[PDB]
From a paper:
The binding of pimodivir into the CBS is mediated via four hydrogen bonds with residues N429, R355, K376 and E361. In addition, residues H357, F404 and F323 create π–π stacking with the inhibitor and the azaindole part interacts with residue Q406. The dissociation constant (Kd) of pimodivir binding to wild-type PB2 cap-binding domain was 2.2 nM, which corresponds to a Gibbs energy of binding of −11.8 kcal.mol−1. Pimodivir bound to domain with a large favorable enthalpic contribution of −11.1 kcal.mol−1 and slightly favorable entropic contribution of -0.8 kcal.mol−1. Stoichiometries of the complexes were close to 1 (one pimodivir inhibitor to one PB2 cap-binding domain). There were ten water molecules bridging pimodivir to the PB2. All of the active site water molecules had favorable binding “free” energy in the pimodivir:PB2-WT complex at the PM6-D3H4X/COSMO2 level of theory. Most favorable were water molecules 1 to 6, especially molecules W1 and W2 had highly negative binding “free” energy. The largest difference was found for W5 of VX-787/PB2-WT (difference of 1.66 Å).
RdRp of IAV is highly conserved among influenza viruses. It is composed of three subunits–the polymerase acidic protein (PA) with endonuclease activity, the polymerase basic protein 1 (PB1) with polymerase activity and the polymerase basic protein 2 (PB2) containing five-prime cap binding site (CBS). Host five-prime cap binds to the PB2 cap-binding site, then PA cleaves 10–13 nucleotides from the host five-prime cap and PB1 synthesizes viral RNA. One potent inhibitor of the cap-snatching process, pimodivir (VX-787, JNJ-63623872), is a cyclohexyl carboxylic acid analogue inhibitor of host five-prime cap binding to the PB2 subunit. We have crystallized proteins of PB2 wild-type (PB2-WT) and selected mutated forms PB2-H357N, PB2-F404Y and PB2-M431I in complex with pimodivir and obtained four high resolution structures.
Residue numbers in the entry: 322 to 483
The structure:
C-alpha cells in the first residue's frame, strides 16, 4: 500500500522498473523523476472516490472512477493524471517557477507536480485530450469542464454512475 493525493494505492497486477529521467515542464523547469516502466494496474481508495487505474510507461490506459460528487471525482482524476507521468501532464505545468524556487528542500517531484495541479487543474484537463466512447451501460464520460457526456470523455477516463 502507499498513499498519494489522499488515495490509498495498491498494485493489483503487473510490474515496473524505475528509470531516473530528466523531464522538462510546460514552464521550462527540469524535474528528475523516477519513471516507472511496464504495465500495471492499481486500485485507488479515497474517502469520497474510488478508482481502478490501468497504466503503462508514462501512459494512462484506463481510469474507472466512482465518487460522491463532481469535485470528488475530479480530485481522483487529477491524482491519476499525475500518477500516469504522461508528457501532456508534465507539459501542462504553468506559471511561477516554484519547483526551481525550492533547491535544498529536496522535495519529491511527483508530490510537487500533484500540489501544482491541486492549485488549478484547468490547463491539465484542457491539454489531456478527449475521445469518443463506447456506450457501456452504467458508465459515462466526463469532459474537461467536469460535466458528463454519453458520447465523449477525457482520454482513458470513465465514471461508473452512482
Ligand atoms: O517517490 C515516489 O516514487 C513515490 C511518490 C510518487 C508516486 C508514488 C507515491 C508517492 C511513488 N511510490 C510508489 N510508486 C510506485 C509506482 C509503481 N508504478 C508507478 N507508476 C507511476 C508512478 F508515479 C509511481 C509508480 N510503486 C510503489 C511506490 F511506493
Ligand atoms: Br519521483
Ligand atoms: Br468533440
Amino acid at each position: 500500500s502507499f498513499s498519494f493525493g489522499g488515495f490509498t494505492f495498491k498494485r493489483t497486477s503487473g510490474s515496473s522498473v524505475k528509470k531516473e529521467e530528466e523531464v522538462l515542464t510546460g514552464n521550462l523547469q527540469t524535474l528528475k523523476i523516477r519513471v516507472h516502466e511496464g504495465y500495471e494496474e492499481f486500485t485507488m481508495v479515497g474517502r469520497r472516490a474510488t478508482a481502478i487505474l490501468r497504466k503503462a510507461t508514462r501512459r494512462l490506459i484506463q481510469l474507472i472512477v466512482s465518487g460522491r460528487d463532481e469535485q470528488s471525482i475530479a480530485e481522483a482524476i487529477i491524482v491519476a493524471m499525475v500518477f500516469s507521468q504522461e508528457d501532456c501532464m508534465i507539459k501542462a505545468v504553468r506559471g511561477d517557477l516554484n519547483f526551481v524556487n525550492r533547491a535544498n528542500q529536496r522535495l519529491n517531484p511527483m508530490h510537487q507536480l500533484l500540489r501544482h495541479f491541486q492549485k488549478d487543474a484547468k490547463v491539465l484537463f484542457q491539454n489531456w485530450g478527449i475521445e469518443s466512447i463506447d456506450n457501456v451501460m452504467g458508465m459515462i464520460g466526463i469532459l474537461p469542464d467536469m460535466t458528463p457526456s454519453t458520447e465523449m470523455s477525457l482520454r482513458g477516463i470513465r465514471v461508473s454512475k452512482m
